[PDB]
Write a protein that binds this DNA or RNA. Structure first.
Lengths: 183, 127, 106, 197, 96, 167
RNA sequence: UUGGCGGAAAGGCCUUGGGUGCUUGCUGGCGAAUUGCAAUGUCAUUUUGCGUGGGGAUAAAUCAUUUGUAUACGACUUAGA
RNA sequence: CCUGAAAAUGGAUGGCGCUCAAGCGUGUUACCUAUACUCUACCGUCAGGGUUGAUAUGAUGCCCUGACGAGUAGGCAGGCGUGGAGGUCAGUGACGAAGCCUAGACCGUAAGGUCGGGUCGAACGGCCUCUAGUGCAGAUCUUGGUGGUAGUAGCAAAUAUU
RNA sequence: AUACUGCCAGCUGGGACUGAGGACUGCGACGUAAGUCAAGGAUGCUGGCAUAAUGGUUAUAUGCCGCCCGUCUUGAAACAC
RNA sequence: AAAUUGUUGAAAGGGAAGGGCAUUUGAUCAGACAUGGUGUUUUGUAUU
């Protein structure tokens, strides 16, 4: 419980979560943002295509000094990758959320990933040995992954406010004069 | 309902923010005088933040006066309205943040009976 | 009629300023057709409107106004100094303002 | 005043006209300057060529494509003068420069519209008689502008069409003048003359 | 110099038409079809455009393409370019 | 407690004002404004319209009329600062104007609860307008073109310079 | 509706014959008010979206596979119902 | 005015640009504007002074008049805030104390104080005094934690794997 | 005569900023006693709104301005720490 | 709690960003009632 900021209703939503996942937080964030807002089944097909190298995750924030690829063309970027491990973690969580939605009785064909979020888990530390007898850190960057799938619906906003209006005596007189003149 | 006083003039409605309190997070916003030897703020170079001076002082007649013209006064029980009772046109009560809901209701009722204006007659009550 | 204007066209030139400091509290207005202080003295003490448009209606109108008046002549060439209730927003340097014919002395 | 003021650039001195129209742009006038090849500069042609070569000598040493971009067309020379006279690096200066449009010859949008003159920038009025001056078209073509002759032939075409239009206007105006002379000498014309019209 | 118009031919070879495609095999080969439809009449949009080119257009350049089906390359995509005509008048160049 | 008390307490009664030494004297209208002068209105619903000026009311406003028959401006009061007094004058003799005053221009202010979100002229007023305008047209008809002048409205054309225009 | 002319950025300017409205060229009748003594007292939009109907024609590009006239990776050049 | 008159990145009457000047010498006025001058309001400081009388009142009050206000090092004054202590508010509080978050409000020139909303769960505050291990942006400060660099350098010696 | 200079407790206009104080007291002016006054600091009449309209806070845009603070130093934004 | 981070939302962005004075624009927000009642056309008749 207590996920990130979601704007949906839990009645038509299901969740999945995974903490202390020893997978790269940056590659995982790129994968999550890749599938974010997609249809559940479309995103699953895309993730298996990424595993098959037919498509790529576009690296948009954590992409310094990574290579270029024609597979970025479909996303409008040049820097894309194929993070097998984070893709596998994310699709395991996707299948878990689909299981939860089926349990809750959600249509599962109009399910789309409304919320996906990965932040930094506590690091796992090791030692690395440098020249001249020095020790440096060798730290994993695990991920806290969480996601919410929900059913697609139509436009959710309508029936705006009353919008009370205050005119002056001059404006009321002008409106009356115009009304009397017009036929 | 209240006495017409001289107009309440605020010479500096802007907050005096400490220099570089925007630049650094460790530098709190609370005003601190810059006492550096080279400080442009201390030297009052053109284009720098204004420094608090006594010339910004408020009119004695309108000092401590809220917008309504009443001076604000913390109360914590029904007893303190009993020193605010006969000065409703120059003093406004204010319920302390620490008052429980029932005592807050009783102070509100006492102030309403006495005609005392309170500055927060909305906390802990619904629409 | 086809022409309905009851005012005089003018342009908001700039704020009152030195070489490198400006005073937003007084703006400079160029009245069309005046090129002399003796000409501008006629418009001295005359109301001025900056009429602009916003996409959100407020009081039944999408048109908002700032009112001011011509205080004194400026310079040698028929520019005047004007003061508005709210200072003009400095994106209107070169925007048209309306110099009405009231209060009237003729 | 007007929505757009179109200035016949012939016979104007570049700096005086540039100061005029820069002030007009800042005040909020839209200005279009045509016939920029006939725009004058005071001083000998050789002297102004030397000035332009001194300008041409300036460019960023480490990369000449970052340095000053010396434009060669007469309209661009006048535009550079104006941009020097405007505070071009601010939003207001950018807007004032957007209000401006310079041309060689008189393109179709403006060959059918009135062209005015700024007399305080005019070479005949300003310069001493016998004082030497250059022409911006000749200077531009000497320093690398490649459209002097095509502009010349288009200008000749425009002159011919404009002279035909003027002859037609003269004939129509003459017929109207005869008509109003005949219908004149009436009570209405007498009363208008007594009224000042 | 500014291009006024380009008049084309009634029938375009598949070799040159292959130049206007990057995926030619997986296409409907819809290329110059409506232009050819504008053709098959005398001057509905052809002789008038050629008259425009004669009346204006101090420079006329012929669009040509290479016969790389004849050339032994594996290309099958004709290189099409422009060759300027440098003789006679504009009318002579255009009707040439 | 939270706040003990103030140290001293000031006076509490309302302060009476000092004896103001400002006397109201009658306004001296500008010399161009004589009764019968044709004015042009500069603001209001009837902005730009040409009326005649009849009498200077006691609340420092001027009584004008179109006449209502010619241009549609009824018997109204206007500010002398929002009119332009013109050279042309019509003799307002033969019209009675002594009846009109602030009492005559009573309004019966609308209520504060009457908020017009979805929400006429007295016969006596229409009759005075009719009689005054009759006695006024009887004078206006004599000089030529003046009825047309009053009917036509005023506006500034391009090139009109008020500092040079002699109205 | 007709005949034109204008390629410099023409994208506009003329013209023939009809339908229709106004005409202050000169005389009339009716109406205007109350917005209350001014409040810009709202009158122009190469915007966009959602709708209705009068028409109109029913593609490509990218990835993947391939080529090597190209190539660090992109990119380029090819081919492929 | 010209010749004398040659320096290294491209280049500076500030720039554009200016030739009966927008140059030089001189003269006459008009005009622009400094935190200066004048006149007002308000703030503080200083000085000079008024003010006994009785309920409902403090004369460590109320009021009148004038002048003045730049500041490092430095001195003094009046205040704000923190831990603890004596007194007092028969003070606030599990019906929610303390703490914390909040481009919500109010007050003070400011130090800061008060309040609204959320979180929380057991103590805490106002006033008169006493006291000090009492206020941090720096000290290559101390301890702990966390960044950009950065998914980067790199994980290429010892023949080699299928 | 006019020009120029000086003076007027000479006259007549146009415009802007300000309204501090809060019973009387004072110096006056005009008047014929009484009163009135522009004489020790703004009053009178009128209108609109009475709500985010004015205003506050906040983010942005715009005009002008604004070098990185602490320190040692005659001198620091410093290519000084 | 802060540094630091993810998501969502708002806004800006032509070789920095941040700031002062001033307005505009968007968002957001505090502050005057009806209170004694000379009028009393009125209920639980001194209860508005």
């Amino acid at each position: 419980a207590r996920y990130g900021a979601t704007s949906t209703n839990p009645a038509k939503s299901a969740s999945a979560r995974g903490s202390y996942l020893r997978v790269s937080f940056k590659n995982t964030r790129e994968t999550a943002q890749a599938i974010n807002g997609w249809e559940l089944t479309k995103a699953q097909k895309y993730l298996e295509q990424v595993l098959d190298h037919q498509r790529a995750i576009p690296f948009r924030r954590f992409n310094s000094s990574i290579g270029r690829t024609a597979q970025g063309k479909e996303f409008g970027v040049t820097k894309a990758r194929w993070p097998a491990k984070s893709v596998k973690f994310v699709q395991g969580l996707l299948q878990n959320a689909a299981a939860n939605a089926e349990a809750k009785g959600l249509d599962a064909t109009k399910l789309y990933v409304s919320h996906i979020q990965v932040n930094q888990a506590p690091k796992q530390r090791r030692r690395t040995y440098r020249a001249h007898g020095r020790i440096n850190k060798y730290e994993s960057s695990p991920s806290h992954i969480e996601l919410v799938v929900t059913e697609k619906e139509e436009a959710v906003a309508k029936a705006a406010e009353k919008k009370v209006v205050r005119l002056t005596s001059r404006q009321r007189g002008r409106i009356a004069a115009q009304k009397r003149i017009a036929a | 309902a209240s006495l017409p006083h001289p107009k309440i003039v605020k010479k500096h409605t802007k907050k005096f923010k400490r220099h570089h309190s925007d630049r650094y997070h460790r530098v709190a916003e609370n005003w601190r005088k810059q006492k550096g030897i080279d400080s442009v703020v201390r030297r009052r170079f053109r284009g720098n933040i204004s420094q608090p001076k006594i010339g910004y002082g408020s009119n004695k007649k309108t000092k401590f006066l809220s917008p309504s013209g009443h001076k604000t006064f913390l109360v914590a029980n029904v007893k303190d309205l009993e020193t605010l009772t006969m000065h409703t046109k120059t003093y406004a009560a204010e319920i302390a943040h620490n008052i429980s809901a029932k005592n807050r209701v009783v102070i509100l009722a006492r102030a309403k009976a006495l005609g005392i204006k309170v500055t927060n007659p909305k906390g802990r009550l619904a629409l | 009629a086809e022409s309905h204007r009851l005012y005089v066209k003018g342009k908001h030139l700039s704020y009152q300023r030195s070489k490198r400091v400006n005073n937003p509290n007084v703006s400079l207005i160029k009245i069309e057709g005046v090129a002399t202080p003796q000409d501008a003295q006629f418009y001295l003490g005359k109301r001025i409107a900056y009429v602009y448009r916003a996409s959100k209606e407020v009081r039944g109108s999408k048109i908002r106004v700032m009112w001011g008046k011509v205080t004194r002549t400026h310079g040698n060439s028929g520019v005047v100094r004007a003061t508005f209730r709210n200072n003009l927003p400095a994106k209107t340097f070169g925007a048209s303002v309306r110099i009405f014919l009231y209060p009237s002395n003729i | 005043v007007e929505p757009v003021v179109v200035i016949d650039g012939k016979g104007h001195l570049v700096g005086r006209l540039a100061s005029v129209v820069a002030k007009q742009l800042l005040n909020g006038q839209k200005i279009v300057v045509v016939r920029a090849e006939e725009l004058n500069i005071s001083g000998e042609f050789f002297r102004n060529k030397l000035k332009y070569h001194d300008f041409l000598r300036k460019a960023t040493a480490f990369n000449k494509t970052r340095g000053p971009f010396h434009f060669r067309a007469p309209s661009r020379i006048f535009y550079k003068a104006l941009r020097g006279m405007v505070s071009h690096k601010t939003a207001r200066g950018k807007a004032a420069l957007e209000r401006l449009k310079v041309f060689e010859g008189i393109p179709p949008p403006y060959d059918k519209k009135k062209r005015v003159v700024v007399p305080q920038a005019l070479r005949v009025l300003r310069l001493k008689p016998g004082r030497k001056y250059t022409t911006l078209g000749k200077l531009s073509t000497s320093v690398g502008w490649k459209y002097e002759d095509v502009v010349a032939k288009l200008e000749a075409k425009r002159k011919v069409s404009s002279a035909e239009y003027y002859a037609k206007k003269r004939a129509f105006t003459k017929k109207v003048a005869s008509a109003n002379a005949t219908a004149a000498e009436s009570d209405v014309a007498k009363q208008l003359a007594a009224l000042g019209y | 110099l500014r291009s006024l118009t380009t008049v084309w031919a009634e029938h375009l070879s598949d070799e040159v038409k292959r130049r206007f495609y990057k995926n030619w095999y997986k296409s409907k080969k819809k290329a110059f079809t409506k232009y050819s439809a504008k053709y098959a009449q005398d001057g509905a949009g052809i002789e008038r455009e050629l008259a425009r080119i004669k009346k204006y257009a101090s420079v006329v350049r012929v669009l040509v393409h290479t016969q790389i089906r004849k050339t032994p390359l594996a290309q099958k995509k004709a290189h099409l370019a422009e060759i300027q005509l440098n003789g006679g008048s504009i009318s002579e160049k255009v009707d040439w | 407690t939270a706040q003990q008390a103030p140290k001293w307490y000031p006076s509490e009664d309302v302060a009476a004002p000092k004896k103001t030494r400002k006397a109201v004297r009658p306004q001296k209208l500008r010399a161009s404004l004589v009764p019968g002068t044709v004015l042009i209105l500069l603001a209001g619903r009837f902005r730009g319209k040409r009326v005649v000026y009849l009498k200077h009311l006691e609340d420092n406003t001027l009584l004008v009329t179109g006449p209502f028959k010619v241009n549609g401006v009824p018997l109204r009061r206007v500010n002398a600062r929002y009119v332009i007094a013109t050279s042309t004058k019509v003799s307002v003799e033969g019209v009675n104007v002594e009846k009109f005053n602030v009492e005559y221009f009573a309004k019966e202010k609308l209520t504060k609860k009457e908020k017009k979100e979805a929400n006429e002229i007295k016969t006596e007023r229409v009759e005075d307008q009719k009689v005054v305008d009759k006695a006024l047209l009887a004078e206006i008809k004599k000089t030529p073109l003046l009825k047309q002048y009053l009917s036509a409205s005023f506006s500034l054309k391009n090139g009109d310079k008020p500092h040079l225009l002699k109205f």
